[PDB]
Amino acid sequence: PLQEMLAAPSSFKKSHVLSVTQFTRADLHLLFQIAQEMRLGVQREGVLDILRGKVLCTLFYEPSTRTSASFDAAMQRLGGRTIPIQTSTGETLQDTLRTLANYSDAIVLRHPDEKCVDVAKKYCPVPVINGGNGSKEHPTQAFLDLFTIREELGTMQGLTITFVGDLLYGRPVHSLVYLLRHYQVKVQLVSPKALRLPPAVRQQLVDAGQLLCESEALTPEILGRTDVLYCTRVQKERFPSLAEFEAVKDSYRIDYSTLKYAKPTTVVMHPLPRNEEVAEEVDFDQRAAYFRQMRYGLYCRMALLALVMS
Template structure:
């Protein structure tokens, strides 16, 4: 972790994950006790070249609750020197001089790595196109452990837009650090899980299947990880409509789920989880979003470790 960057899920091993989760539990206590001023002399810059609500606000809240300051833009593509033709690398070189840590979300796969190559401060990848979203995957994994009590031995179903779902890619990579994992990939035909993700799972001995019947999967999975069909990632409306509305978690599906299973979603949702599901105790996605604050506080803490 050169300069304590967080760039992708593959950089973490199990020992590192356990350390991050321990720090995350400590951060839950920090928030419960009213926050901290330990980083009152630190500045975080948030550079979001792609829209975000939860990720950006949770990072900003995390820094604020640790006593730090936040500067940046939620629309860097339109309201920055980028529109004048400045390269990402030049932007990062300049902003590094203003900051102690930079959070970046970008439309291009690999943008975080490009930023880290020239940055003089830690870079935290808040999503790079259809590539990865490592901080989301970390909070997803933390939520699974917190809700179920374990990660080893779980059966997780990943549902929806698996081709463009960077959260699914990152979570799949993180799960290779655990034992006896089984993954069911349930997706429309035109947004199946990429071959390179399956190869990584094969290389690490992870059991998985591609199963089109969501009811069948729901009957045996410990975790249903639902994702949005991402309209903005499709080249045509026709391709989007082929995938949209195929897999929906509703009251009927709840009757097929195990009583001790949970439903996760990285949010925002767009109809793929019915509102009626929210009242079910297995619906953990809002608790999952709350955990994003604690995880990102922990990552900021790790950024400043010597």
């Protein structure tokens, strides 16, 4: 049933996983199927059998424990072997990739240079998974985000999604807008005017018939119609004047006074790490899904690794 679904055909098999723009609605539907199966297999036996004999190497030039350990644990729970590497940007990336390709069957790469995906494509002779390229894309983060929504709420039809915070530099938002192109959702965008979406991402939303509201304020009416409250970090450097920055924090902080205006079923998401824009007092609330996000990311990356490495 799982050996079945992994028998199926996919763009993932033997492929680099560098951008969400490589994958179709069907690609992701199959992936999410396999991720449900992965969750069942693990719930019963802990470490499965899919990838005995396969070696994954993780190559992180900047540390991101959530992502690197997620891939480590996914590979090992597939029954594969992992080689975790920590380094910093003097040997070039293309030399390191070609070095490590001789040891492993695939590499997860996170690197401060967004052109790293291009280097990986030109030089690396094994599949590379893009674990973050200068903060431009992080495709499995987009995957696990979409999956989180599906899993927590059921069908995508009818949903209203509210992105809050820094939507200019918040690329996980942009990647997720792309993945939502296939769905009859409405979207609200709460941000200062200085940090609205890039005009082309906004244009992606109006083109799909999805842009509902744009607002600088996180209001009880916006909150009352939110099925999904996807928050982003808002860093002080994005503002010239500190006063502005704190005004915007206090406005956007998800705490109990903010959740009271929400729905009983509102899913609160966050790619993490967070500063104070989601209060700790909310972590135990059923609607707080940002730790369940990471267990969903476990099952999605098991599926992705199974598909890429057969």
